[PDB]
Structure formats: C-alpha cells, structure tokens
Amino acid sequence: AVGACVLCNSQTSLRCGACIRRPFLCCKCCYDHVISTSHKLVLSVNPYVCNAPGCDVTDVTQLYLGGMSYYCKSHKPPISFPLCANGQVFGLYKVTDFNAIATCDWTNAGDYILANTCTERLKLFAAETLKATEETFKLSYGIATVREVLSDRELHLSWEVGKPRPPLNRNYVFTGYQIGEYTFEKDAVVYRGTTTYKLNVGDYFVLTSHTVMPLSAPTLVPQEHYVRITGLYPTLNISDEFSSNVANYQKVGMQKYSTLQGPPGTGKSHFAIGLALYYPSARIVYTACSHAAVDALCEKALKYLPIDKCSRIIPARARVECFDKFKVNSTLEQYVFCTVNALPETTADIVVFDEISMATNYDLSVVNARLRAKHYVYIGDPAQLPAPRTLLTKGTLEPEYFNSVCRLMKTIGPDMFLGTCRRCPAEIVDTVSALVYDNKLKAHKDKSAQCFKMFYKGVITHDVSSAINRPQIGVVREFLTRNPAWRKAVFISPYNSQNAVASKILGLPTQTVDSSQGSEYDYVIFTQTTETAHSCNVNRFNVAITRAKVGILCIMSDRDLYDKLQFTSLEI
Ligand SMILES: [Zn+2]
Ligand SMILES: [Zn+2]
Ligand SMILES: [Zn+2]
C-alpha cells in the first residue's frame, strides 16, 4: 500500500481503485484525476469508503475524515474534514494525459498517439493499461467445441451462441482443452495444433489469456553520448564484407543506444552479425518479438559467427518450430538469440533488438527490464508493418506512434540509415523510395523488366470480413498460362481468405503481406483484393512489393497506388 506516484514520484498511500492497473497517485495528482474523471474510488491500506454501517458511499469527493475514520456527508461527525479539498486528497507524505490513458477504451488511434507522446512513466502506465485491456477483452468471445474430426488437418466446430466469434487467422492462437495451443484457417475449417493430437469430439478451445505483469524499466534508457568507444574492443583486421558499416559500428560504441533504419534488403541482418565481428570479445544478445525474426538472425549468425558461441533460447512452452542448429537454452553463450517474451534475466555488452516496427512499448520496457547492457541497438524500419493492435478499430496508427524507437526515427531521424537496397529490381526500389523513404533509398540492381501492374477491380466477396477477389485470382491464372517462369511465384495478398482461394485455384505458396515481412522470394504475385484502408496502407504496400528479388505482378484495386507503381502495365 506504499509506493511512488506514477506522474510526479511524490510517495503516497493512495492508488486509484477505478484504474484497472491501480496506479499510485499522490495527494495533488490523485485529486486532479478523481475530480476530472468518472474514477472516484481511492485505495489506501483501507479503501476510501463510508465507515458507517451499511453505507455504500465510495466516491472520494462525497467523503470526509471523521478523526481517523472515513464517512459520507450523511454520516460524518461535526469535526470532519473533506477528503477532497484545496487540490489534494487526504494522504500520507502530503495530468490531462494521465486521465485520457486511464479512461480510454483503446479503440481509437488518438489513444495510441497519446500513449507515445506522453512522459516516460506515462508510456509504461499506457503500455500495461493497454495490454491488460487487450487481455480482459479475450474473455469477451465465444467457445468452439469439436463436433466432428474429418482428418489430421481439417475438422468441424460448434460455436457458443451470444458471444461473438473470433477471426480464423494466424494472429489468433487458441488454447485447447491441456492439449497445447491450436491455430485455424477457414463449413470446413483447417485445424493446426501446435501439438499433434488426435482431436477429441467434445473437446473445446479458449483464447490464451496471459497475466499482464507490471513494467518497471523505461521503453528507452536515458541517452548517453561518449567521446570514445566504451566497454567494447574493436578489431583492426575487419572483413571487407563488413567494412561499409565500420563508421556505424563505432557510433554504436559511442552511444548508450542507437537506431538503425534499414529499408527492405539494405543489410539489417548483415549489420547485426557484423557488429559481433567488429567487437569480437563482446557478449551480444539478439532479440526480436517474433520467432521468425529471431530465426533470420540465427541464419545470418550461422554463416559468420562460431556455432559454439551461439545459443537459441526456446521457451519450454513451444508455439512454433524454431532454429535447431545452435545449442538450445544455454543462457551463458557469447551469442544469445531469443524472443522478447522468453528473455532470461541477464547482462550483455550489446543488445541488438531487430524488427523494431513490430515492437510495442510493452516489449521495449520488458527488454530494458530483462537485459542490462552497455549498448542497445534498435534495428528495423518505421516504413514496415507494426504489431497488430487488436482493440484499435477507429483511425490509422501512423509510424511515429508504433513505439518510442519508431517515434525517434520519424521525428529526429535514425542514427544510422542503410541507403542501398540490394534485393529488389530497380522498379520496386524506385517506387518504395518515392512512396515511403523520401527518395533516399537507392537501387543496387538494375530494372529487371519483370515488374508488372494491372488495374483490375474485379469482384469483392467476403468470408465474414476477410475479403476475396476471385476475378483478380482469375486474371493471375491467365497470366500464369502465358508466363510459366512465374510458376515458382509466392502469392501475396492483404487477406488470409484471398490466399486460401488462391492456394486452391493457383496452387502457388501463399503468404499475407504481414506474414511475408522479413522474407524474400524471386517472384511475387500480389492481388490487392480490395481498396480498403488495410489494403491501401502504404507500409503494408511497401512490404508487399519489396519481397521480390526478380519479378512482381501487382493486380491493383486502388488507382492511387497503381499510378505510383513504376512497373510495366499489362492488359486483359
Ligand atoms: Zn503526483
Ligand atoms: Zn483512475
Ligand atoms: Zn455514509
């Protein structure tokens, strides 16, 4: 019951009882909160409730101190002082933004904007409040019971009436009942258990409701600039492969933290592994939110770093298959590759946090809490996709609001920028450079003359809210008959249901724009499917077309993005 005020640190016995996180609020701040919001329950050792028997007065503005006890206006003794007066609430040791975070439902973009523009202590309050709000929202969905199992990868389900049905995509990972986590894809549904089990008829599934721990560490530690490289010892014999990043690796040792904006295929992973070769004695912990992002760093390390000094940390509760070439769960290795949610409590000379656009302020704070480092490097791209905000339904979340690191990269600029894309044909590089990089992204490859665009709105159908465009898939099928080299293309769309229909009709491997992030393919066939804000999102658009090494076919719905594509137009 005794803590520090979550806005001005002034110690207090007061906590807000109406706040879902019950933050410690001081006398002067607690008052400013309760007088401005519907939040009136104040908590101490004992709550601020009318001590008189059978009285349900809990509002702190309607209460008084009757010597040492608390009473309402109807039960107070003559010698009683109001709890609320003179800009203070009676407490021991005797903000408009805090009120908005404390009371919002997290469905508006303006809520996330504030959660990033506010002070550092309010960013942590916003991050735990949001995550707890996101968790309690998991209880607000219906249960799915197994009616019949058709095969090892397909079954039928009975849904709970009254409670809404969750979207059947990769994003939502259910918990089977204790038969492990279970994913699904759209009455014939495709079941995918994270544990191979003979699905029982009668068994049911419920969403993974995890406990929101409190945040102690800031999203970003305070910046320190040094005159020399600190606690790190550079090589003189530096591989010419990594010579392009020498000045940036030196910048890394002369700052507490550094930001790196690496557009698609500009050398982010190469930069991260090369930092290990530049400071060969430094213990480095490689982290990211996803297992796929941690695995991509493991792949590059396997090629340049000694396999004996590496360890891939796998949480005992396995959710997907992982990188199996390093020693598993050896926390004391020089190189430790681990997802944020699985990080052990340890120290490092350098912490490298990759795919920074996918991180939330919650993850930024967890990393600062689980890892104590001499240097922190944040690598990613604010022009790529952020983490999904399941509660956000109104307004669009701009890149400067993804997290603290992205806010810095978009306002003051990144400390380091990888300006040459070595993956994409120049048609794609020139398009995304103008679209999201203010003409600063350069092409290393020449124009491939294999980048096509087709303006074809088609017909939009819906599998609930996930969209399908069968005519756009028809146009692709027609193109494939005339272009057999594209037989090896990966099909990409903004919708899982579009991808499910394309997988059956075209037989091409399928990927949503969001799941393709961090991956590359020689050929990519992209159908925009709709002209919604989701399918027209410039960050999603940038990720979609930058997956291609050689060629891309874009069947577009939006005139704007189609006209922006510096591709050869096709007819039919
Ligand atoms: Zn205060
Ligand atoms: Zn409150
Ligand atoms: Zn009373």
Question: Whose atoms come closest to the Cα of 91: which ligand?
Answer: 1
6 alpha carbon, closest ligand: 1
State the Cα–Cα distance between residues 453 and 482, nearest whole angstrom: 15
Backbone angles phi, psi at 175, to 5 degrees: -125, 120
Residue 327, number of CB atoms within 10 A of its CB:
12
- φ and ψ at residue 261, rounded to 5 degrees: -95, 110
d(CA 17, CA 37): 13
β-pair partners for 108: 394
Give the other-Cβ count within 10 Å of 208's Cβ: 12
Q: Answer yes or no: are the C-beta atoms of 290 and 318 closer than 8 Å.
A: no
* Distance from the alpha carbon of residue 91 to the mean position of ligand 3, in angstroms: 20
Structural domain of residue 542, as residue ranges? 421-564
- How many angstroms does the Cα of residue 40 sit away from the middle of ligand 2? 7
Element (H, E) at 266: none
* Ligand found nearest the CA of 48: 3
The token duo for 261 is 């904006």
Q: Give the H/E segment covering residue 501.
A: helix 496-506
**35 alpha carbon to ligand 1 midpoint, in Å?**
14
Q: For residue 163, what are the CA distances in angstroms to 135, 144, 201?
A: 16, 11, 21
Among all bound ligands, the one having the nearest atom to the CA of 57 is 3
Q: How far apart are the first and last CA of the chain?
A: 71
CA of 215 to the centre of ligand 2 (A): 18
The answer to whether the beta carbons of residues 545 and 428 sit under 8 Å apart is yes
SS3 of residue 138 by DSSP = helix
The one-letter code for the residue type at 499 is N
The rounded distance, in Å, linking the Cα atoms of 229 and 242 is: 18
List the one residue out of 565, 546, 540, 492 whose CA is nearest residue 265.
546
**Count of beta carbons in the 10 Å neighbourhood of residue 147:** 13
Q: Measured in angstroms, how far is the CA atom of residue 47 from the centroid of ligand 3?
A: 13
User: Nearest to residue 239, comparing CAs of 267, 266, 276?
Assistant: 276
Distance (angstroms) between ligand 1 centre and the Cα of 94 equals 10
174's tokens: 């259910």
Cβ atoms of 35 and 22 closer than 8 Å: no
Ligand closest to 23 (CA) is 2
User: 99 by DSSP, 3-state: which?
Assistant: helix
Going from the Cα of 22 to the center of ligand 2, the distance in angstroms, rounded, reads 7
The ligand minimizing its distance to the Cα of 36 is 2
Residues 424, 445 contacting (CB under 8 angstroms): yes
Please list, in sequence order, all residues whose beta carbon lies within 8 angstroms of the beta carbon of residue 139, skipping any fewer than 6 positions away.
209
CA–CA distance, 382 with 267 (Å, rounded to integer): 16
**CA angle (226, 276, 262) in 5-degree steps:** 80
Contacts of 539 (CB under 8 A, 6+ apart): 357, 383, 384, 385, 386, 399, 436
Pairing outcome for strands 420-421 and 284-288: unpaired
CA dist., res. 354 & res. 97, Å (int): 30
DSSP 400: G
SS3 at position 369: helix
Beta carbons of 568 and 551 less than 8 angstroms apart = no
Residue 532 belongs to domain with CATH number: 3.40.50.300
Of 371, 397, 322, the C-alpha closest to 110 is 397
Nearest to 416 by CA among 272, 271, 276, 261: 261
Question: Which ligand is closest to the CA of 27, given by its number?
Answer: 1
3-state helix, strand, coil in the chain (%, to 5): 30, 25, 45
**DSSP assignment of 553-568:** EEEES-HHHHHH--SE
* DSSP H stretches of helix in 137-203: none
Nearest ligand to the CA atom of 43: 2
In b/e form, how buried is each residue of 217-231, taking b as 16+ CB within 10 angstroms?
A: bbbbeeeeeeeebee
Taking Cα atoms as reference points, which of 314, 318, 316, 317 lies closest to residue 326? 314
Q: Bridge-partner residues for 339, per DSSP?
A: 288
Distance 58 CA to ligand 1 centre (A): 22
**Ligand 1 centroid vs 5 CA: distance in angstroms?**
5
- Helix ranges restricted to H, 209-360: 246-253, 268-278, 291-304
- Of how many residues is the chain composed? 572
Task: Quote the tokens at residue 143.
Answer: 């249960």
Do residues 521 and 547 touch, judged by C-beta distance below 8 A?
yes
Asked if residues 523 and 551 have their Cβ atoms less than 8 Å apart, the reply is: yes
Residue type for position 293: A
Binding site residue list for Zn(2+): 5, 8, 16, 19, 26, 29, 33, 39, 50, 55, 72, 75
* C-alpha 255 – ligand 2 centre gap (Å): 38
Q: What is the whole-number distance in angstroms between the Cα of residue 5 and the centre of ligand 3?
A: 28
- Cα(41) to centroid(ligand 3), Å: 14
- Distance of alpha carbon 124 from alpha carbon 403, whole angstroms: 11
Which residues have C-beta within 8 Å of that of residue 55, sequence separation ≥ 6?
49, 71, 72, 74, 75
- Please give the distance, rounded to the nearest whole angstrom, from the Cα atom of residue 214 to the centre of ligand 1: 19
Q: How was this structure determined?
A: X-ray
Residues comprising the binding site for a ribonucleoside 5'-triphosphate?
A: 262-269
396 within 8 A of 533, measured Cβ to Cβ: yes
Say how many C-beta atoms besides its own lie within 10 A of residue 379's C-beta: 26
Residue 263's CB is within 10 A of a number of other CB atoms, namely: 27
Distances in Å between the Cα of 426 and the Cα atoms of 48, 445, 542, 555, 562 are: 67, 6, 14, 19, 17
Cβ atoms of residues 33 and 97 within 8 Å: no
| Cα 71 to averaged position of ligand 3 atoms, centre (Å) | 5
Which residues define the annotated binding site?
A: 5, 8, 16, 19, 26, 29, 33, 39, 50, 55, 72, 75, 262-269
Structure tokens at 560: 């704007």
Burial of 3 (0-12, 13-18, 19+ CB in 10 A): middle
User: 474 CA to middle of ligand 2, Å?
Assistant: 55
Please say whether the beta carbons of 269 and 275 come within 8 A.
Answer: no
Distance (Å) from CA 100 to ligand 2 centroid: 10
**48 CA from centroid of ligand 3 (Å):** 11
Phi then psi dihedrals of residue 388, to 5 deg? -65, 135
Q: Are 297 and 322 in contact (CB under 8 A)?
A: no
Which ligand ends up closest to the CA of 24? 1
